[PDB]
């Protein structure tokens, strides 16, 4: 299932991934409270706000 970033988000280390609005990603899992999801883009992996993405 493919996703798209709704807003830009900037990684602040901490295993996070910066993503740009309109970028496509794959979602590989969620953290315990669901606020973060493990994303994979063309640029790499890392955690991104679950609220910042939606399926394509």
């Amino acid at each position: 299932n493919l996703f798209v970033a709704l807003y830009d988000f900037v990684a602040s280390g901490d295993n996070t991934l910066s993503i740009t609005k309109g970028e496509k990603l794959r979602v590989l899992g969620y953290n315990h409270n669901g606020e973060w999801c493990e994303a994979q883009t063309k640029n790499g992996q890392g955690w991104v706000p679950s609220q910042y993405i939606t399926p394509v």
Partner: peptide
């Protein structure tokens, strides 16, 4: 994953 909250949607 980060322990802290994500930024709310803009």
């Amino acid at each position: 994953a980060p322990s802290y909250s994500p930024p709310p949607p803009p």
